[PDB]
Write a protein that binds this ligand. Structure first.
Ligand SMILES: CC(=O)N[C@@H]1[C@@H](O)[C@H](O[C@@H]2O[C@H](CO[C@]3(C(=O)O)C[C@H](O)[C@@H](NC(C)=O)[C@H]([C@H](O)[C@H](O)CO)O3)[C@H](O)[C@H](O)[C@H]2O)[C@@H](CO)O[C@H]1O
Ligand SMILES: CC(=O)N[C@@H]1[C@@H](O)[C@H](O[C@@H]2O[C@H](CO[C@]3(C(=O)O)C[C@H](O)[C@@H](NC(C)=O)[C@H]([C@H](O)[C@H](O)CO)O3)[C@H](O)[C@H](O)[C@H]2O)[C@@H](CO)O[C@H]1O
Ligand SMILES: CC(=O)N[C@@H]1[C@@H](O)[C@H](O[C@@H]2O[C@H](CO[C@]3(C(=O)O)C[C@H](O)[C@@H](NC(C)=O)[C@H]([C@H](O)[C@H](O)CO)O3)[C@H](O)[C@H](O)[C@H]2O)[C@@H](CO)O[C@H]1O
Ligand SMILES: *[C@@H]1O[C@H](CO)[C@@H](O[C@@H]2O[C@H](CO)[C@@H](O)[C@H](O)[C@H]2NC(C)=O)[C@H](O)[C@H]1NC(C)=O
Ligand SMILES: *[C@@H]1O[C@H](CO)[C@@H](O[C@@H]2O[C@H](CO)[C@@H](O)[C@H](O)[C@H]2NC(C)=O)[C@H](O)[C@H]1NC(C)=O
Ligand SMILES: *[C@@H]1O[C@H](CO)[C@@H](O[C@@H]2O[C@H](CO)[C@@H](O)[C@H](O)[C@H]2NC(C)=O)[C@H](O)[C@H]1NC(C)=O
Ligand SMILES: *[C@@H]1O[C@H](CO)[C@@H](O[C@@H]2O[C@H](CO)[C@@H](O)[C@H](O)[C@H]2NC(C)=O)[C@H](O)[C@H]1NC(C)=O
Ligand SMILES: *[C@@H]1O[C@H](CO)[C@@H](O[C@@H]2O[C@H](CO)[C@@H](O)[C@H](O)[C@H]2NC(C)=O)[C@H](O)[C@H]1NC(C)=O
Ligand SMILES: *[C@@H]1O[C@H](CO)[C@@H](O[C@@H]2O[C@H](CO)[C@@H](O)[C@H](O)[C@H]2NC(C)=O)[C@H](O)[C@H]1NC(C)=O
Ligand SMILES: *[C@@H]1O[C@H](CO)[C@@H](O[C@@H]2O[C@H](CO)[C@@H](O)[C@H](O)[C@H]2NC(C)=O)[C@H](O)[C@H]1NC(C)=O
Ligand SMILES: *[C@@H]1O[C@H](CO)[C@@H](O[C@@H]2O[C@H](CO)[C@@H](O)[C@H](O)[C@H]2NC(C)=O)[C@H](O)[C@H]1NC(C)=O
Ligand SMILES: *[C@@H]1O[C@H](CO)[C@@H](O[C@@H]2O[C@H](CO)[C@@H](O)[C@H](O)[C@H]2NC(C)=O)[C@H](O)[C@H]1NC(C)=O
Ligand SMILES: *[C@@H]1O[C@H](CO)[C@@H](O[C@@H]2O[C@H](CO)[C@@H](O)[C@H](O)[C@H]2NC(C)=O)[C@H](O)[C@H]1NC(C)=O
Ligand SMILES: *[C@@H]1O[C@H](CO)[C@@H](O[C@@H]2O[C@H](CO)[C@@H](O)[C@H](O)[C@H]2NC(C)=O)[C@H](O)[C@H]1NC(C)=O
Ligand SMILES: *[C@@H]1O[C@H](CO)[C@@H](O[C@@H]2O[C@H](CO)[C@@H](O)[C@H](O)[C@H]2NC(C)=O)[C@H](O)[C@H]1NC(C)=O
Ligand SMILES: *[C@@H]1O[C@H](CO)[C@@H](O)[C@H](O)[C@H]1NC(C)=O
Ligand SMILES: *[C@@H]1O[C@H](CO)[C@@H](O)[C@H](O)[C@H]1NC(C)=O
Ligand SMILES: *[C@@H]1O[C@H](CO)[C@@H](O)[C@H](O)[C@H]1NC(C)=O
Ligand SMILES: *[C@@H]1O[C@H](CO)[C@@H](O)[C@H](O)[C@H]1NC(C)=O
Ligand SMILES: *[C@@H]1O[C@H](CO)[C@@H](O)[C@H](O)[C@H]1NC(C)=O
Ligand SMILES: *[C@@H]1O[C@H](CO)[C@@H](O)[C@H](O)[C@H]1NC(C)=O
Lengths: 317, 317, 317
């Protein structure tokens, strides 16, 4: 009689199809998905420090648009800019806007220190009905609109040394009046000049007079510039008109901070990986949710599914 | 007596050498080449819509150099620029030429809609012997050279609303006269100013007077600028001299269009993949013909040959 | 009785741990390191031609700062810039400094040919106590500071044809005086204009008057520009003041030359691969010494060690 001894292996009734080098569809006992394809639709507020911009762009929070006063001196790991955001102060532009936005985002702080420039011979604190703060005509909080005093605008030549151990970021601008009359009414002379310099840089700007389309009834514009002043260096502002002066400096830091455009709500939860769609889990090595990511994130790929076999070939009877 | 039964495999008299992980040269029964190394030397005119630039750059076709009048309102998937191309109109430059070329190429259309600006107080339609159209002094078709009327150039302040559902691309410029006399002869005053703006952008230009080397006897130059006007926005042109005005706007589209520099002839044939050398077949995954490609193309690699084994090791007797 | 015949394999007492696809730590008989992790701490002077900048940046050697006179007409495969380098001539800046540095570095030569411009009506060879050469007030060797002659600065309109078979690189500048008085004292009129052009390019610059912080007692600044003139083209310089003129042109070549920032000493030895840390051997395919490399170099990776098995699994008794 004797015996029979058979060697064999398991199988399952519910196998999974995977791809290999030689076969686009082969059934195995089990697999695991390597492409994360969903978000929870909210940005978790831990572990990254999230600052919700609400109605404010980062640049408006920097300059000090009145609706952004709550952002003064705030810090973030990730600043979230919303598509509903709008400007509601004096009309302005920023040559190389994207660069100023990037460098502030990456710095992660709006910490601002006031400095006394001792502006002498000019009127300070110019305001506009385009920039309403507490029902009164106002202006960007961090900027100082200088105009004539007694129909004289005497040449400004002002120094501010950096005696600190850190870099200072100065934000300033040039006012472009809508007409030649407005140039006189504000600066009591026909041609402004601004030169802002350090030992290692110089920026010279000429206003360009002319009508731009009216925003909150203003055909004029301000153009925003920035200057970084290193320790041991000196800021030198030399101007005969059209200066929108700084009130102080921002701390500029280095670290892990950034900015992201998203309409996802902020949630009370923990997730290392943030996308504009919301936080996503980061167990899987890849994801197809969004190319835009912040934190410890799976790598973006253009595959909806990649199944890794975790078992042998499934061979049912 | 019994029998012998031998197991074995085929071989061929004409084997092919391939590379593996362990051997740089090993003979197999057959292989296939994975690097496409040739073109047919012509750009096939299907399935992509090809527009042969002939003597015209895309920028000259845009501005309306007289030799390019046949390109008015044409559309393309791929615009082909030839090395024989030359300019034959008023001498000009384009600050960020490469960007204007790119954005027009990518748009894929020179569709142009005329608009009436109602220029009042100035002479329109200035011409030059540097730009001959039908044996007569002429000018860029899409540009309007404004000069004084009765030795007055009254300030221009003109609006053009965008009430359409699409974006408008405006092309305009500034004339830089060769001398201070020419400035007077043309604009009847010493200092032109141009400000072109929308609600969301501003461009201010000052002419720079001086002699450039003479091209078709002209020591002056035009510098070309562009402005995109979104729906609900307004173009505002404010100028006291030196304006080379737009005659209307170009449609700006998004899609799959591009531009390529090539001297290859156009052929009547079908090929998905275009290179400057000519169309190439796209069966193989890689190619060493050209890094520059358009369409469904093999990936460029720096290998002249990569043979994929399609058979076993060849072991002749 | 009979016999026993045992098949087997070697083992070693000192095996090495490697990683595989299925096991992060498995012992093999031998391995080799694929990541080069050290430099010899000196830049070997063969086979690449090395030029040690010493106290000079490449840009200072180009302009002709007095401490850099030893670099006139020198050539390099790799220019080495040291962190101790400092400028000691007239204070200047270069709009797009990084681009001028790159294009000169890549060219590999400071070969300079003098040309006679025949400046008539102006004083040549202006000097400054900010730029001392042999205990005397001097200036950048390759630049010519033109000022008034007999309180007239007659308009300059000068040509220089390129009748050579190669491209010419012209370096020139604009002087920005510290005050309106200095503008008069130097150029005998209130508003300088510079226009430098060829048949295919134009650069127009306006000086910007104003105080910058004093460097070697100078509140003024020069801004440096460049112009490439092709064979058959012509340089045209047209100016009414504030021109810092070229004395000739640099040869601009193409080849394998570059520039590197390093404090490593130069050594008498041979090594194909240079990093800022020093030369490294290039037997291994990868390295973690520095992302910055020049020559035949292993590829930079973020791994400290990658051991390639060169023997079987080690299975001691
Ligand atoms: C210097 C001055 O008071 N100039 C008067 C013009 O402002 C005025 O033109 C009207 O200005 C209207 C808006 O007015 C303000 C504003 O923005 O709210 C008033 C501000 O006090 C003034 N700011 C400063 C620091 O002087 C500001 C500024 O002049 C403009 O913003 C520059 O463009 O203007 C509004 O724009 C009207 O449409 C406009 O007509 C004229 C005539 O009304 O009188 C001027 O004396
Ligand atoms: C406004 C005017 O007519 N000015 C006269 C100068 O053009 C002229 O200088 C000569 O100009 C020659 C080329 O002449 C045109 C041209 O480009 O064909 C004639 C055009 O009608 C004129 N265009 C307009 C809209 O006015 C145009 C323009 O003035 C220039 O292109 C600007 O640079 O010039 C050629 O360049 C000669 O070399 C040049 O001497 C002078 C003296 O001849 O008379 C002026 O009244
Ligand atoms: C044209 C002239 O001689 N102007 C005199 C001013 O230079 C002078 O101001 C003082 O200038 C001091 C430095 O002087 C030089 C220099 O850089 O060494 C002397 C040079 O010859 C001159 N170069 C040329 C080509 O003229 C040069 C130039 O004027 C300046 O560099 C432009 O900024 O100046 C130093 O900066 C002192 O701090 C400054 O007061 C005034 C009064 O002293 O007299 C002017 O006539
Ligand atoms: C199919 O394979 C997957 C992947 O190994 C298994 O999922 C793991 O299950 C363990 C135990 O439940 C968990 O701790 C892990 O989190 C899971 N890993 C992953 C990557 O998801 C799954 O259990 C297997 N299915 C069967 C029937 O064995
Ligand atoms: C230049 O033209 C514009 C457009 O007509 C003028 O601005 C308009 O002015 C009217 C009347 O005050 C306002 O109702 C409109 O809101 C303005 N439109 C825009 C688009 O701004 C402008 O005032 C003119 N410039 C000058 C200096 O008179
Ligand atoms: C920078 O500030 C200086 C110093 O205040 C200005 O120079 C003065 O300008 C006034 C008005 O033009 C003159 O009356 C004085 O004679 C000048 N003073 C000196 C010491 O020269 C200069 O105008 C300012 N420059 C700019 C670009 O605004
Ligand atoms: C995450 O957000 C992205 C970006 O919004 C989504 O992709 C876009 O979806 C819209 C409308 O469904 C398409 O018209 C766009 O073409 C998509 N953009 C891109 C850049 O691909 C994406 O579907 C979202 N993913 C998840 C999982 O919610
Ligand atoms: C060598 O292998 C190649 C690749 O499989 C074979 O080429 C294919 O041949 C079939 C039938 O003729 C064609 O339909 C395919 O277009 C070819 N494929 C490729 C990638 O070129 C070739 O026939 C084989 N040679 C032999 C002798 O069997
Ligand atoms: C500035 O100099 C240039 C160069 O000499 C002058 O342009 C030349 O003028 C002559 C005589 O008309 C022509 O034959 C040449 O073709 C011109 N050469 C170039 C390179 O353009 C120019 O006219 C001078 N500028 C002024 C305002 O007189
Ligand atoms: C923009 O257009 C406006 C309005 O036409 C110009 O302002 C007029 O300019 C003339 C000439 O200088 C003056 O006589 C008028 O008094 C101005 N009108 C008004 C209502 O202020 C202005 O000059 C133009 N601006 C530019 C930059 O060209
Ligand atoms: C396709 O065109 C490219 C670009 O013209 C050819 O490569 C160039 O060939 C010239 C002259 O033979 C060389 O001097 C250049 O160095 C090459 N350029 C580059 C960027 O490599 C290429 O040989 C052509 N290929 C085919 C198959 O026709
Ligand atoms: C361990 O393996 C390495 C790599 O093959 C051996 O190193 C080689 O040794 C030969 C002969 O000494 C040299 O010519 C090569 O330069 C070495 N190659 C590398 C990549 O370093 C080493 O000899 C082996 N060890 C043992 C005990 O066999
Ligand atoms: C503008 O202000 C600066 C700063 O006070 C003046 O430059 C200083 O001048 C003093 C006196 O000569 C020197 O001791 C300092 O070295 C200078 N400081 C700096 C930072 O440059 C400058 O002279 C003023 N401008 C004018 C035109 O008077
Ligand atoms: C370029 O050079 C030309 C020619 O020398 C200059 O034109 C002369 O300028 C002077 C002074 O303004 C006048 O008196 C002459 O009448 C002009 N000559 C001619 C032939 O027109 C011109 O000023 C210079 N341009 C620049 C921008 O510097
Ligand atoms: C080679 O040089 C690099 C760059 O200096 C060294 O890496 C830096 O080391 C410093 C101080 O040890 C760190 O603070 C920096 O973060 C490092 N920089 C970067 C970009 O990583 C590197 O250690 C040197 N390597 C060797 C082998 O000498
Ligand atoms: C944002 O702006 C909208 C519309 O003006 C307003 O209703 C809303 O209250 C604002 N939200 C905040 C948080 O300021
Ligand atoms: C301007 O306003 C600032 C901030 O409110 C204040 O510190 C300062 O006293 C004001 N200065 C003048 C001159 O009005
Ligand atoms: C292109 O220019 C050349 C040289 O001027 C001319 O002979 C040729 O006919 C032109 N071709 C076309 C299609 O315009
Ligand atoms: C200018 O030329 C255009 C296009 O040919 C024409 O429509 C217009 O009537 C001309 N206008 C004047 C004022 O000459
Ligand atoms: C470089 O500068 C330092 C400090 O001024 C000086 O001591 C040294 O001799 C200089 N070296 C050379 C080679 O010029
Ligand atoms: C200026 O100096 C250069 C170089 O030393 C010399 O060739 C020339 O003769 C000088 N020219 C004048 C006008 O002083």
């Amino acid at each position: 009689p004797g015996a029979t001894l058979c060697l064999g292996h398991h199988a399952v009734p519910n196998g999974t199809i995977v791809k290999t080098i030689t076969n686009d569809r082969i059934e195995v006992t089990n697999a695991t998905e390597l492409v994360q394809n969903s978000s929870i639709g909210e940005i978790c507020d831990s572990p990254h420090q999230i600052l919700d911009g609400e109605n404010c762009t980062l640049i408006d929070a920097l300059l000090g648009d009145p609706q952004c006063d709550g952002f003064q001196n705030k810090k973030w790991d990730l600043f979230v800019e919303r598509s509903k955001a709008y400007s509601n102060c004096y009309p302005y532009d920023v040559p190389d806007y994207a660069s100023l936005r990037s460098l502030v985002a990456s710095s992660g702080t709006l910490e601002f220190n006031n400095e006394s420039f001792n502006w002498t011979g000019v009127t300070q604190n110019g305001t506009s009905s385009a920039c309403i703060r507490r029902s009164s005509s106002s202006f960007f909080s961090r900027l100082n609109w200088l105009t004539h005093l007694n129909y004289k605008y005497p040449a400004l030549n002002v120094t501010m040394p950096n005696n600190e151990q850190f870099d200072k970021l100065y934000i300033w601008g040039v006012h472009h009046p809508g007409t030649d009359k407005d140039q006189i009414f504000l600066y009591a002379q026909s041609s402004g000049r601004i030169t802002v310099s350090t030992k290692r840089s110089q920026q010279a700007v000429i206003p360009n007079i002319g009508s731009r389309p009216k925003i909150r009834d203003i055909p004029s514009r301000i153009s925003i510039y920035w200057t970084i002043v290193k320790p041991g260096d000196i800021l030198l502002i030399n101007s005969t008109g059209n200066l929108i002066a700084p009130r102080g400096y921002f701390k500029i830091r280095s670290g892990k901070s950034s900015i992201m455009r998203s309409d996802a709500p902020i949630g009370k939860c923990k997730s290392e990986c943030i996308t504009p769609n919301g936080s996503i889990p980061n167990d899987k090595p890849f994801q197809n949710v969004n190319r835009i990511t912040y934190g410890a994130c799976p790598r973006y790929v253009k595959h909806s599914t990649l199944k890794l076999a975790t078992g042998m070939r499934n061979v049912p009877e």
